[PDB]
């Protein structure tokens, strides 16, 4: 029996688009019926690859990889935006967290997760790109920020670029979305001094 995504794409469903709440990710499926979103504009890396890997799964599950009210004490997690509105009210992805400054500081961020699900874990995150350097300071305070995501099989360092861009859905900023598969027993480590759209919920699954 297939996975019914209704009016949402894989991106909107996997990212947790607020308009895909009632969608339910059943424990296993053979294929995905779809209607091809990302309410915050940006680039979803290896999107077609992900659609292929999620094409048929067993033992699928959505779990809380970094609890919102514990994992980030020294950062603000309540960031919402009108680009991802729900019920005429600004909101944000249900599987991600927009980390911003708290009390005028954005302390160096470091958090890690060990895969104890005995299955493959799909982790997704984002990198946010303001359009001017003043706002970069206001939101994250460091001018030359970095984001680092490392596992035993994945390693990448993201540098945000500050550029004036045309408005998309009324937004001049951008959030690029990335993902990786975490093998059982492996550890993934997130490090940043800004611009990290942190994983809030993640997914554990057996492929095929």
């Amino acid at each position: 029996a297939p996975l019914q995504l209704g009016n949402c794409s894989v991106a909107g469903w996997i990212l947790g688009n607020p308009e895909c709440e009632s969608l339910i990710s059943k424990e296993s499926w053979s294929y995905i019926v779809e209607t091809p979103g990302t309410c915050y504009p940006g680039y979803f890396a290896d999107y077609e690859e992900l659609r292929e890997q999620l094409s048929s799964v067993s033992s699928f599950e959505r779990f809380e990889i970094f609890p919102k009210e514990s994992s980030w004490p020294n950062h603000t997690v309540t960031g919402v935006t009108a680009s991802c509105s729900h019920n005429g009210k600004s909101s944000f992805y249900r599987n991600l967290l927009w980390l911003t400054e708290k009390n005028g500081l954005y302390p160096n961020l470091s958090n890690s997760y060990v895969n104890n699900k005995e299955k493959e874990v799909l982790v997704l995150w984002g990198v946010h790109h303001p359009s001017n350097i003043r706002d970069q300071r206001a939101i994250y305070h460091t001018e030359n920020a970095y984001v680092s995501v490392v596992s035993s099989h994945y390693s990448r360092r993201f540098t945000p670029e500050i550029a004036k861009r045309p408005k998309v859905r009324g937004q001049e900023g951008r959030i690029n979305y990335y993902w990786t598969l975490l093998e059982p027993g492996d550890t993934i480590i997130f490090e940043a001094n800004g611009n990290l759209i942190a994983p809030w919920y993640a997914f554990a699954l057996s492929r095929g």
Partner: antibody
Amino acid sequence: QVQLQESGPGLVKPSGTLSLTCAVSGGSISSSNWWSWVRQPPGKGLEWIGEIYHSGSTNYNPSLKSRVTISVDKSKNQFSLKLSSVTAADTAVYYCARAPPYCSSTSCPDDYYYYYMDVWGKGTTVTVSG
Amino acid sequence: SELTQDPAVSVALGQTVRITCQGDSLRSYYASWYQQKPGQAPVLVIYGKNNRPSGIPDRFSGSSSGNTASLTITGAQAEDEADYYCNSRDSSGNHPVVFGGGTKLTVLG
């Protein structure tokens, strides 16, 4: 529970310089806030004077720019206001207040598109007279 | 630019009144509202949109549409008789802060 309190002379001679200091307590000025000054002439509305960041960068009312100076002093947890060449038009109740951070572009969360002054000083009356 | 609001309006005891604030600056920044009584400092009643500070009664609500922000008072009480200023940040230049002229609210009855 930040609280503000103005202080300074209640009388300033014409062509003189008004000097007020706002004492900040219950919190640190080193923060993400815009420490602001507001005034209200007798029987008139509110007029924004200027704001200052703890770094020392300032943003002033254009109509008062060439007479206004707003300073910050982290040694005493205070910020101050100086207004030169005062006339009868500068007689007013002066308030110091606290504003939140903001963004100039549409690339920030909604919290950075508010403007308000939530905490206010009790206000101190300044009258310009000989 | 500037924020323009009616300088005076009346409302009967227990009725509902909507005070309007207009200005192109409201297209990119949220409008806050203050209540002021003679001899007292302004008191913030709306942070922006429809968020009230702690201690502000529920009958003070905020809405907006276009370049117009509105403060609605449902069931006006005697103590609501005061001046109401709208306030936002200019969207041009160095973004100076702008105040509305204020609205003097008379509570009849």
